[PDB]
Amino acid sequence: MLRSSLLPFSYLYEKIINFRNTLYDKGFLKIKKLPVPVISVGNLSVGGSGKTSFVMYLADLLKDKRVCILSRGYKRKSKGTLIVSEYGNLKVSWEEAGDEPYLMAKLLPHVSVVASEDRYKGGLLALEKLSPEVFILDDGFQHRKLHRDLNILLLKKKDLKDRLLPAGNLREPLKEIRRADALVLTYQEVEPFEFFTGKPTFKMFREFCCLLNSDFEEVPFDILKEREVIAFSGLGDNGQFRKVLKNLGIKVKEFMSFPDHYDYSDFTPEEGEIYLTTPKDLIKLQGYENVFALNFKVKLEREEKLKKLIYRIFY
């Protein structure tokens, strides 16, 4: 009675997406090649992805290499190509980087981050200024103009039952799973599933580790014992965030929901209280030393097989 009113747009959208993908499939559009290895991390749908967690996990597997993330930076205060971070050191504000590349940079203290709609051009600037040994595309599955040596696709169980935008959340039809070199089957900790394609496949679990402080440093969740917290969220994470806090058994004396565009210009915390919020909110509250986010770690099955795939792209 409403969502079905969106299906006409979905059928149209499918024609457009399929046509573009056919052009790349058949060599009608140029695929550019950077002179160092490129690993893409991506998914098929809008919505919670685990992509951010996986990028952090992957960058850690490559801790022995000079790594640069090539991020889109969809909405920024600056355009073109922008070095957001030089091996952990932020060079711009979130306002200028966009919330996404800035958050990624804060979550990766030894890695460079470059924001550029055109990932190839971002790669060239990085090669010139940062001399990376490997690039990771965060959210790069659809960016077919840039060759990747290892195309990693994250899939959650919900994706397999979903539909193309705007009727559903899929950015591309499920047949495009064929482009993946490796599949990562996500959210196993709450919606476990199997999916056989013949491709190298890795189940991903995320498990609660500890807290992130406002300097984005890891700290024990011990600090929460015998303390009630005030929790808050700067968007619809209201539902999600509240659930996670409950399932973890964290005692929340109060919850506050803010506008999703909130830049926390008017945020006024109380001395002596402890606050919990999301990492996306936390980036706007650095320096408030009584404000924390939850930190989860990726646990991946057959990790050594993934390490082997990664190793082989350096030849």
From Swiss-Prot:
GO terms for biological process: lipid A biosynthetic process; lipopolysaccharide core region biosynthetic process. One of its GO terms (cellular component) is plasma membrane. The keyword Cytoplasm does not apply. It is an enzyme of class 2 (transferase). Disulfide bonds: none annotated. InterPro entries: LpxK (IPR003758), P-loop_NTPase (IPR027417). Its EC number is 2.7.1.130. Keywords: ATP-binding, Kinase, Lipid A biosynthesis, Lipid biosynthesis, Lipid metabolism, Nucleotide-binding, Transferase. Coiled coil: none annotated. ATP binds at residues 45-52. Pathway: Glycolipid biosynthesis; lipid IV(A) biosynthesis; lipid IV(A) from (3R)-3-hydroxytetradecanoyl-[acyl-carrier-protein] and UDP-N-acetyl-alpha-D-glucosamine: step 6/6. It comes from the Bacteria. One of its GO terms (molecular function) is ATP binding. It catalyses: a lipid A disaccharide + ATP = a lipid IVA + ADP + H(+). The keyword Lipoprotein does not apply. PANTHER family: TETRAACYLDISACCHARIDE 4'-KINASE, TETRAACYLDISACCHARIDE 4'-KINASE, MITOCHONDRIAL-RELATED. Belongs to the LpxK family. Transfers the gamma-phosphate of ATP to the 4'-position of a tetraacyldisaccharide 1-phosphate intermediate (termed DS-1-P) to form tetraacyldisaccharide 1,4'-bis-phosphate (lipid IVA). This is Tetraacyldisaccharide 4'-kinase. It comes from Aquifex aeolicus (strain VF5).
